[model samples]
Target: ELGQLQYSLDYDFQSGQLLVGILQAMGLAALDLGGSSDPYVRVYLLPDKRRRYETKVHRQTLNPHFGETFAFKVPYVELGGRVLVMAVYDFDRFSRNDAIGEVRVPMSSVDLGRPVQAWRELQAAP
Candidate 1:
């Protein structure tokens, strides 16, 4: 059944269960002027129709922040392209009531080093 794998690989970017980080291109200037040259990106998931509007998994801290990286264990049922709706959250925001942004790109569109906004293509354009 390995060859018949419905999903070739599993990633945790949208799920926010994996370590989200950046690699500074040799002394490059900070883009957002936040965190490290290689800031640890904090992404979260919300439920919806493109995805299930439930499992509001969010855990963010303001002061110290998650820094340049984090790790999460994703359940196989939640991902593997079966997932339709999801929301990515920023833990750095001091206010939990702040605007919540999300992406709905194909599961295969992401890889290591791509900016978080890469997923924006899936969002509703303004």
Candidate 2:
């Protein structure tokens, strides 16, 4: 089953910044043996992962509420060239972290002039 991510996006024209808010996630897959997963979100603007951010890990929950916001500095003129990528991963202390899924939003398809909020289904990692 695919997971779903709830988030919000807003572009500040005056400041030339993008505000990304990770609200929460639902129907997440269980990766651990006990049936729950320690989940966190990694966000970045595609084609430039140099500037990235991660939300704090939420322990043992299929549905996690991550009321966190991150900012990326990008000019309005360049926003169309960017893609917002949000990847959900199950944190593992003793082993490699498992990627649950991801949500990608192309800025060219978004109306940055107005605040936007949406729920996008997570897709399998390529």
Best model per TM-score: 2
Q: Give the TM-score of candidate 1.
A: 0.27
Regions more than 4 Å wrong, model 2: none
- Model 2: per-residue Cα lDDT over 6-64, one tens digit each: 99999888888999999999999888888888989999998888999999999999899
lDDT of each: 0.29, 0.92
Question: TM-score of each candidate?
Answer: 0.27, 0.96
Give the candidate number with the greatest lDDT.
2
Cα lDDT, model 1, residue 110: 48
TM-score of model 2 (CA atoms): 0.96
Model 1 Cα RMSD, Å? Answer: 12.4
Please, what are the lDDT tens digits per residue for candidate 1 over residues 1-126?
A: 000001112345566453333211122122223522222222333232232222222232221122133233555345444322223333334434322323333433444333352212123212
